[PDB]
Amino acid sequence: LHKEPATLIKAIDGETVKLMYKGQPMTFRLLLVDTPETKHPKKGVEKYGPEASAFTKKMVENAKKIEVEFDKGQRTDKYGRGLAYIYADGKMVNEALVRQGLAKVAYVYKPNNTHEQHLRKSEAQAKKEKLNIWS
Length: 135
Ligand SMILES: Cc1cn([C@H]2C[C@H](OP(=O)(O)O)[C@@H](COP(=O)(O)O)O2)c(=O)[nH]c1=O
What we know:
The chain has helices at residues 49-61, 93-99, 116-128, and strands spanning 3-13, 16-20, 25-30, 33-34, 66-70, 82-88, 91-92, 104-105. The chain has 135 residues and is α+β, with helices and mostly antiparallel strands. The protein has one domain (1-135): CATH 2.40.50.90. The PDB classes it as hydrolase(phosphoric diester).
């Protein structure tokens, strides 16, 4: 896998960010993470939806360097969103959320699953500690 630089344009929610990637604004959906939603023509504002959005927003906004890391399968989903692992100053946003109990490991579509084991290890650790989603 290889990380490439990108520039923050705008944070959308817990699992979606808008980035400038190779001179193009794109919507990126965080691989292997499912956060409670703020906006969703599907049941509204789940508990933690707001906390999850806040966490991603602060993390990518206070970063001096943003990197996108594609997995080894398809890099876009059917809605044209890039599918990647995003790093804010060397730290993976996807893992940070799972570790804090603000997301659950979801949507595993092979072969876009390189870090699934690493994230599931983080999820168990957060459940163990009864954090947010798991409290
Ligand atoms: C994370 C991810 C989502 N998607 C699709 C699955 C869902 O499709 P449907 O909308 O057709 O059911 C949708 C969930 O996105 P969100 O969780 O952002 O709402 O995005 C992929 O196709 N591949 C992925 O890796």
